Each structure stands twice: as structure tokens, then as C-alpha cells.
């Protein structure tokens, strides 16, 4: 009685809420699905959904589902849309360079200390940014020679 | 033709006259034009006079009448909506509740 009504009978378990958005273009009013879920593969695999034109906001799901280039394109589009929402414009070359830096090792790596450590190699910069003592002791243990490039 | 404003002399976006001078004739010409503007505009603005007073912000009689009519109409429509929601059924907009 505590969990029998809470069983899924139809739909994607990761999908929490889907709504029918409509575009009222003068030529034609078309219908699309706005899904507040975290499963892009399941949405594309469902019947009646044109998976060729399905996007998402979560860059990790796009990376895992449609490749690293689709993730880069999603990052670019999402950053540009978020910037335009506030009325301020940024040249596309900057966001393209940012997405390329985030997606040049084959995996979307963030700007946090973990992604910065996975991308960069210089010990001095890793120590100066965050986790000074830990990085310094790890470098002393590994004996990693750091250049001045 | 036309009158100068922020759309043409301000730092908003492109189509600025100083931007056109910078992109067409170099930096020195744009700097000289900006210096001439900054030395000319204050002189004329002081010799002509530009002031704001309490009379520049006071409302007119027609404005007061229009404001009164609009306030009355808006309050009547808001009271009608309140009465419709509290007593009876109110047309619920899509994607949201009645409140």
C-alpha cells in the first residue's frame, strides 16, 4: 500500500514531466515536446519522436549519447542562448574557443579544479589555483618535472 | 539629415560615427573628432542653458483625468476577477492554476 501506486506502468522512469509546447507561426502552428527529464536516448528512441532534431540542455547526456561534437555544439548553442536571454551579445568565436577547450581531449571537462587538473599539466598552476599542499606533495612523490612553458 | 543621439554618438553598438571614423580613417582621426566634440558640446550647452525644474515633471489636467479613468477601470476589472474567482468559476489560463 505504500509503494503499489508508486510503480511505473508507462513512460520513461527518468522522465518526470513532459508538456506540449506549441509554436504559433503564421504559416503553421506546430507541436513539440518539452521534457523535464534526464534521459535523451529514451526520448529519441520513443515512437513518433523525430530524434534527428532532438536537443537537450544537459551537456553530459548529449556527450554520452550523440558524441563529443554534438556536446560541443550543444554547449555553444546553450551559452549563446543564455547570453541572448539577458540582452547582451558575445561574439561566437569566444564561445567556440571555450567549447573546443572543453572538448579537445574527447571528454567534456569542466572549469573546476578536477577538469583543470585533467587538462593542464603544469604543477605550479595546479598548486596556485586550488589544493596547494595536496598537488605539491603529489608532485614531490611523482617527481614530475614542470617546465616553464 | 537627422539628429545625433545615443544610437549614433553613444557607446551602445555599431553604426556609431566615431566607430565609422575609427574603421575608415584610423585611430588618430577618431580621437581628434572625439576631442573636438568634448570641447564643443559643453560650450554650446552652457551658452544655451539646459535646466530641469519641478514644472518639468508636473502632470497636466488631461493626464490626471486619464489616470483617474484608467485607475477606476482597472480596479473595477480587478474586483470583477476577484469576484469571479472567489464566487464561481474563473477561466483558468493554460499551464497554471486559478490563483
Amino acid at each position: 500500500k505504500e509503494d503499489l501506486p508508486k510503480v511505473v506502468v508507462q513512460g520513461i522512469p527518468e522522465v518526470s514531466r513532459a508538456v506540449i509546447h506549441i509554436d504559433e507561426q503564421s504559416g503553421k502552428e506546430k507541436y513539440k515536446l518539452l521534457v523535464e527529464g534526464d534521459n535523451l536516448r529514451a526520448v529519441m528512441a520513443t515512437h513518433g519522436v523525430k530524434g534527428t532534431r532532438t536537443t537537450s540542455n544537459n551537456t553530459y547526456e548529449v556527450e554520452k549519447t550523440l558524441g563529443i561534437e554534438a556536446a560541443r555544439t550543444t554547449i555553444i548553442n546553450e551559452i549563446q542562448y543564455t547570453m541572448v536571454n539577458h540582452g547582451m551579445s558575445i561574439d561566437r568565436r569566444h564561445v567556440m574557443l571555450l567549447s573546443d577547450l572543453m572538448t579537445y581531449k574527447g571528454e567534456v571537462l569542466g572549469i573546476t579544479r578536477f577538469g583543470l587538473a585533467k587538462m593542464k599539466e603544469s604543477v605550479l598552476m595546479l598548486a596556485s589555483f586550488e589544493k596547494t599542499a595536496d598537488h605539491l606533495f603529489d608532485a614531490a612523490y611523482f617527481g614530475q618535472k614542470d617546465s616553464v612553458c | 539629415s537627422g539628429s545625433m543621439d545615443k544610437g549614433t554618438l553613444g557607446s551602445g553598438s555599431k553604426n556609431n560615427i566615431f566607430y565609422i571614423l575609427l574603421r575608415d580613417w584610423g585611430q588618430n582621426e577618431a580621437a581628434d573628432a572625439m576631442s573636438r566634440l568634448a570641447r564643443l558640446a559643453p560650450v554650446y550647452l552652457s551658452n544655451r542653458g539646459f535646466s530641469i525644474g519641478i514644472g518639468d515633471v508636473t502632470p497636466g489636467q488631461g493626464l490626471l483625468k486619464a489616470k483617474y479613468e484608467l485607475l477606476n477601470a482597472g480596479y473595477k476589472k480587478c474586483d470583477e476577477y476577484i469576484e469571479a474567482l472567489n464566487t464561481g468559476k474563473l477561466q483558468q489560463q493554460p499551464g497554471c492554476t486559478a490563483e
Binding site: - | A38, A41, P42, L45, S46, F50, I52, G53
Partner: protein, 50 residues
């Protein structure tokens, strides 16, 4: 006696233009008082600051 107007372009952003004759006759004249304190204390030994 403030007059709200633009004058000489030296009051572009929040600035104000003051009158020389007004400041010369005592308008805005201010006084700053500072304190300088010194101590001549007797130590444990029978000697003192002089």
C-alpha cells in the same frame, strides 16, 4: 544657492561646479583636529622616561 544646469562640461557624471568667491568667503570651510598622544611610563627598575 544651487542652480540646476549644465555648465562648462565639468559636471558630467555626478560632479558639481563650485564658486570661487563662495569658497573664498567661508563656504565649505572645514577644520580637522587630530590627536598625538605620548606616554612616559616608569619601568620595573627605578628609571623613568624623560
Amino acid at each position: 544657492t544651487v542652480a540646476v544646469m549644465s555648465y562648462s562640461g565639468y559636471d558630467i557624471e555626478d560632479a558639481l561646479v563650485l564658486n570661487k568667491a563662495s569658497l573664498d568667503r567661508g563656504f565649505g570651510r572645514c577644520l580637522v583636529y587630530k590627536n598625538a598622544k605620548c606616554t612616559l611610563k616608569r619601568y620595573t627598575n627605578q628609571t623613568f622616561d624623560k
